[PDB]
């Protein structure tokens, strides 16, 4: 294997002697050379572990490093300042100052210019982080909501131009907001030029996808593949018009890229560098689990998938240090956490906490949540969870069966209950969700619907507003970067017309992708409305989180409340949080509170609470007590 010094000398061979002397004395080359020294051994090691003695590895690597240098050279000086800042502040992601939001540009603001016009609202809300849903060109009609990408470079013209996107990112940065976008690197649309040219037999795109002559290998693979959208097709493959079969983990119009071809890694690393130099701060690594395949396995979470992501990480450390990764792994918690590492994905979605928030609202019992917060919350140094309540996707019940079994809970039976409960097929349920991907072969099902729909706001359940507050309080205070599904902060309900659009009617996730509700946002400062009640209470929690250092960092210790309905945990040995998941009043006894200070200020309600007597919480009440 080559060394960084050898490879650097060859990078420079493209220059005339006169040009080269100038480059070698330059600040950019000095920084690039330093980062090569520090980070190239990781890049080489990870790529070696995946591709081994492949003839194409060294030529690909040299091509990639040449691109990395050109990319860093071209990179804007303002971005190079963020590179340095984050290179010397790896824990910026862990600051209590960070609060994120996510929205669709079209649904929330019409187009990119409209989105730029909403930036003052984002500042008003206190956001420091904004994830914009897939922005680039995609098939007309059905595109999995933009996740079938036809071009990584050309903006969806319904949203505007690449110039509009540049103005948005600059305007976000001006407003103190990180720009977060998707890196959809497991698959492209079937209309992507790479896909068309690969299928057409263009030798330049040979082996860019997984294409088979018949069902022989697809049948073998399907013995062990999980079905993500069983409504759409069985197993992991779809048939082309010419009779061949292509790997399609997701929709039939999403073709899995073939990372066993090192030139595919190179191609996507080039796409990553392009996004980096737009000034993107965080790339959401979509479908991380699926980027390596192996017969006889689930073709999820394989060692090479992790190694490739670590290879991508090294490329950013070399050529765009400001760019961090957010892993999307929605799976068993033992597998979710493996993507999170300073050298892999520095942050990642926390589906366990999210799913168990909803679980706890249904059961009223904090057992599973307490277990998760006790044993699966704390992370390695320089990493963080992204804690959330809802997303653009369905809710999957991804708690661990093994964990549940310790508590005497059958995972299978419990999921059957949660699914009935949240689609209003259980006596007395307050939830108004919609099924998503019921799989008759496994009994698995997921849930669609907005936060407000799932807590009972559609039917004006008097507890709905407080339920929303409780859920978000936990995401905001457990430690990690909280992510608001924009629209939730004014109680936005389902798009009840989603099923009438023939492009959407077989995908119930569209139920919880409503447009910006002008009527609700107009009432956000009106305490007489649900919208204003939700907004003011969420905004207050955001303000407290961001201003109070007791929330800093990602670590917590749970507190045994001795009440099966009340969750408790402590931040920085200084903030004691209680959340009541019962619709009835619930007490923490004076006996349970004996070790605490005599009195404590509650940041939620603003009163001084006596801890030497029984503490009774109203239904769904949250308390944030300063105990140091």
Ligand X SMILES: OC[C@H]1O[C@@](CO)(O[C@H]2O[C@H](CO)[C@@H](O)[C@H](O)[C@H]2O)[C@@H](O)[C@@H]1O
Ligand Y SMILES: OC[C@H]1O[C@](O)(CO)[C@@H](O)[C@@H]1O
Binding residues: 144, 187, 254, 284, 392-393, 509
Rounded distance, CA 304 to CA 307, Å? 5
DSSP string covering 194-214: HHHHHHTT-GGGTTSB-EESS
Q: Which residues contact 552 (CB under 8 A, 6 or more apart)?
A: 94, 95, 96, 572
Q: How far is the CB of 577 from ligand X (least distance, A)?
A: 36
Q: Using CB distances below 5 to 8 A depending on partner kind, what does residue 363 bind out of ligand X, ligand Y, ligand GLC, none? A: ligand GLC
Question: Does residue 624 belong to the site contacting ligand Y (CB under 6 A)?
Answer: no
Residue number closest to ligand GLC, CB atom: 417
DSSP structure class, residue 506: T
Q: Using CB distances below 5 to 8 A depending on partner kind, what does residue 17 bind out of ligand GLC, ligand Y, ligand X, none? A: ligand X
Binding mask 350-379 for ligand GLC (x = CB under 6 A): -------------x----------------
Binding-site residues for substrate, in ranges, read 144, 187, 254, 284, 392-393, 509
Q: Using CB distances below 5 to 8 A depending on partner kind, what does residue 263 bind out of ligand GLC, ligand X, ligand Y, none? A: none
Rounded distance, CA 67 to CA 55, Å? 20
Q: Which is nearer to ligand GLC, 305 or 356 (CB)?
A: 356
Question: Does residue 417 belong to the site contacting ligand GLC (CB under 6 A)?
Answer: yes
- Mark out the alpha helices in 320-458 (DSSP H runs): 333-336, 351-363, 367-375, 401-406, 411-422, 451-455
Q: How far is the CB of 331 from ligand GLC (least distance, A)?
A: 21
Binding part of the chain for ligand GLC, among 97-105, 138-146, 408-416, 482-490 by CB under 6 A, reads 408-416
Question: Does residue 628 belong to the site contacting ligand Y (CB under 6 A)?
Answer: yes
Q: How far is the CB of 452 from ligand GLC (least distance, A)?
A: 24
How many whole angstroms from its chain centre is CA 621? 28
Question: Does residue 397 belong to the site contacting ligand Y (CB under 6 A)?
Answer: no
| Lateral strand order in the sheet of 211-212 | 211-212, 245-247, 237-239
The dihedral region occupied by 280, where left means phi > 0, alpha psi between -120 and 50, and beta the remainder, is beta
Q: Using CB distances below 5 to 8 A depending on partner kind, what does residue 12 bind out of ligand Y, ligand X, ligand GLC, none? A: ligand X
Rounded distance, CA 586 to CA 604, Å? 17
Exactly one of 83, 106, 164, 286 is catalytic; name it: 286
174 is an active site residue: no
Q: How far is the CB of 359 from ligand GLC (least distance, A)?
A: 8
Tokens, residue 347: 């942050």
Q: Which is nearer to ligand Y, 27 or 174 (CB)?
A: 174
Binding mask 586-605 for ligand Y (x = CB under 6 A): -----------x-x------
Q: Using CB distances below 5 to 8 A depending on partner kind, what does residue 417 bind out of ligand GLC, ligand Y, ligand X, none? A: ligand GLC
Q: Using CB distances below 5 to 8 A depending on partner kind, what does residue 564 bind out of ligand X, ligand Y, ligand GLC, none? A: none
Q: Cα–Cα distances in Å, from 490 out to 80, 165, 237, 296, 324?
A: 38, 27, 41, 48, 30
DSSP string covering 254-270: EEEB-TTSHHHHHHHHH
Binding mask 500-519 for ligand GLC (x = CB under 6 A): --------------------
Q: Which is nearer to ligand X, 105 or 418 (CB)?
A: 418
Q: Which is nearer to ligand GLC, 84 or 407 (CB)?
A: 407
Q: Could you tell me which of 264, 346, 265, 363 has the C-alpha nearest to residue 311?
A: 265
Contact call for residues 131 and 483 (beta carbons, < 8 A)? yes
Q: Could you tell me which of 614, 523, 607 has the C-alpha nearest to residue 561?
A: 614
DSSP string covering 118-171: HHHHHHHHT-SEEEEPP-B---SS-STTTTS-S-SSSB-TTT--HHHHHHHHHH
Q: Which residues contact 614 (CB under 8 A, 6 or more apart)?
A: 587, 588, 589, 590
Q: Which is nearer to ligand X, 128 or 448 (CB)?
A: 448
Q: How far is the CB of 568 from ligand GLC (least distance, A)?
A: 21
Rounded distance, CA 128 to CA 310, Å? 26
328 is an active site residue: yes
Contact call for residues 496 and 481 (beta carbons, < 8 A)? no
Rounded distance, CA 557 to CA 569, Å? 6
Exactly one of 46, 328, 344, 466 is catalytic; name it: 328
- Cα dihedral sign, 339-341-343-346: positive
Angle at 153 between CA 150 and CA 154, to 5 degrees: 70
Contact call for residues 458 and 494 (beta carbons, < 8 A)? yes
Which residues of this protein are in contact with ligand X, per CB under 6 A?
A: 12-13, 15-17, 20, 231, 434-438, 506-508
Q: Using CB distances below 5 to 8 A depending on partner kind, what does residue 581 bind out of ligand X, ligand GLC, ligand Y, none? A: none
Q: Using CB distances below 5 to 8 A depending on partner kind, what does residue 13 bind out of ligand Y, ligand GLC, ligand X, none? A: ligand X
Q: Which is nearer to ligand X, 12 or 278 (CB)?
A: 12
Q: Which is nearer to ligand X, 164 or 507 (CB)?
A: 507
Binding mask 156-195 for ligand Y (x = CB under 6 A): -----------------x--xxx-----------------
Count of residues near ligand Y by CB under 6 A: 12
Helices (H) and strands (E) in the chain, counts: 21, 23
Q: Using CB distances below 5 to 8 A depending on partner kind, what does residue 178 bind out of ligand X, ligand GLC, ligand Y, none? A: ligand Y
Q: Using CB distances below 5 to 8 A depending on partner kind, what does residue 435 bind out of ligand GLC, ligand Y, ligand X, none? A: ligand X
Q: How far is the CB of 61 from ligand GLC (least distance, A)?
A: 52
State the maximum Cα–Cα separation within the chain, in Å, rounded to a whole number: 81
The dihedral region occupied by 235, where left means phi > 0, alpha psi between -120 and 50, and beta the remainder, is left
Question: Does residue 128 belong to the site contacting ligand Y (CB under 6 A)?
Answer: yes
Binding mask 97-126 for ligand Y (x = CB under 6 A): -x----------------------------
Binding mask 55-94 for ligand Y (x = CB under 6 A): -------------------------------------x--
DSSP string covering 340-355: BSTTSBSEEE-HHHHH
Q: Could you tell me which of 47, 54, 39, 51 has the C-alpha nearest to residue 8?
A: 39
The residues of the shown chain that bind ligand Y, judged by CB under 6 A, are 92, 98, 128-129, 173, 176-178, 597, 599, 626, 628
Q: Indicate which residues carry an active-site annotation.
A: 286, 328
The residues of the shown chain that bind ligand GLC, judged by CB under 6 A, are 363, 409, 413-414, 417
């Amino acid at each position: 294997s080559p060394n960084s010094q050898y490879l650097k000398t060859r990078i420079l061979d493209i220059y005339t002697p006169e040009q080269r002397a100038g480059i070698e004395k330059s600040e950019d080359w000095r920084q690039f050379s330093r980062r090569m020294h520090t980070h190239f051994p990781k890049l080489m090691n990870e790529l070696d572990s995946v591709y081994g003695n492949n003839e194409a590895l060294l030529p690909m690597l040299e091509m990639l490093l040449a691109q990395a240098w050109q990319s860093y050279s071209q990179r804007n000086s303002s971005l190079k300042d963020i590179d340095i800042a984050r290179e010397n502040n790896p824990d910026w992601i862990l600051s209590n100052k960070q609060v994120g939001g996510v929205c669709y540009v079209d649904l929330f603001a019409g187009d990119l210019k409209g989105l730029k016009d909403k930036i003052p609202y984002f500042q008003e809300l206190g956001l420091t982080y904004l994830h914009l849903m897939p922005l680039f060109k995609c098939p007309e009609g059905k595109s999995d909501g933009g996740y079938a990408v036809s071009s990584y470079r050309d903006v969806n013209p319904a949203l505007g131009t690449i110039g509009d996107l540049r103005e948005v990112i600059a305007a976000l940065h001006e407003a103190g907001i990180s720009a977060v976008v998707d890196f959809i690197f497991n698959h492209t649309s079937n209309e992507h030029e790479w896909a068309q040219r690969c299928a057409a037999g263009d030798p330049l795109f040979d082996n860019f996808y997984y294409i088979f002559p018949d069902r022989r290998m697809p049948d073998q693979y399907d013995r062990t593949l999980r079905e993500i959208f069983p409504d759409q097709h069985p197993g992991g493959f779809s048939q082309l018009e010419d009779g061949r079969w292509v790997w399609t983990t997701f929709n039939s119009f999403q073709w899995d890229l073939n990372y066993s071809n090192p030139w595919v890694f190179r191609a996507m690393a080039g796409e990553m560098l392009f996004l980096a130099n737009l000034g993107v701060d965080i790339l959401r690594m979509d479908a991380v689990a699926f980027i390596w395949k192996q017969m006889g396995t689930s073709c999820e979470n394989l060692p090479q998938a992790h190694a490739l992501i670590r290879a991508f990480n090294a490329v950013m450390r070399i050529a765009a240090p400001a760019v961090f990764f957010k892993s999307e792994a929605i799976d068993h918690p033992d597998q979710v956490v493996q993507y999170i590492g300073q050298d892999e994905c520095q942050i990642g979605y926390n589906p366990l906490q999210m799913a168990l928030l909803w679980n706890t609202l249904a059961t009223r019992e904090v057992n599973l949540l307490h277990q998760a917060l006790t044993y699966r919350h704390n992370l390695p140094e320089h990493t963080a969870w992204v804690n959330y309540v809802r997303s653009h996707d369905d809710i999957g019940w991804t708690f661990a069966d093994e964990d549940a079994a310790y508590l005497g809970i059958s995972g299978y039976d419990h999921r059957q209950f949660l699914n009935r409960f949240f689609v209003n097929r259980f006596d007395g349920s307050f939830a108004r969700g919609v099924p998503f991907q019921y799989n008759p072969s496994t009994g698995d099902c997921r849930v669609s619907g907005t936060a407000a729909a799932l807590v009972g706001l559609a039917q004006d359940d008097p507890h709905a507003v407080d339920r929303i507050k409780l859920l978000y309080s936990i995401a905001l205070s457990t430690g990690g970067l909280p992510l608001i599904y924009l629209g939730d902060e004014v109680g936005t309900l389902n798009d009840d017309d989603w099923s009438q659009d023939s492009n959407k009617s077989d995908d119930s996730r569209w139920a919880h992708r409503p447009r910006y509700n002008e009527a609700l946002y107009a009432q956000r400062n009106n305490p007489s409305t649900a919208a204003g009640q939700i907004y003011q209470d969420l905004r207050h929690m955001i303000a407290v989180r961001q201003s109070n250092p007791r929330f800093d960092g990602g670590r917590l210790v749970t507190f045994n409340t001795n009440n099966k309905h009340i969750i408790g945990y402590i931040r920085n040995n200084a903030l004691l949080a209680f959340g009541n998941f019962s619709e009835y009043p619930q007490t923490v006894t004076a006996h349970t509170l004996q070790a605490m200070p005599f009195k404590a200020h509650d940041l939620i309600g603003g009163k001084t609470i006596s801890l030497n007597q029984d503490l009774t919480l109203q239904p769904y009440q949250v308390m944030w007590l300063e105990i140091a």
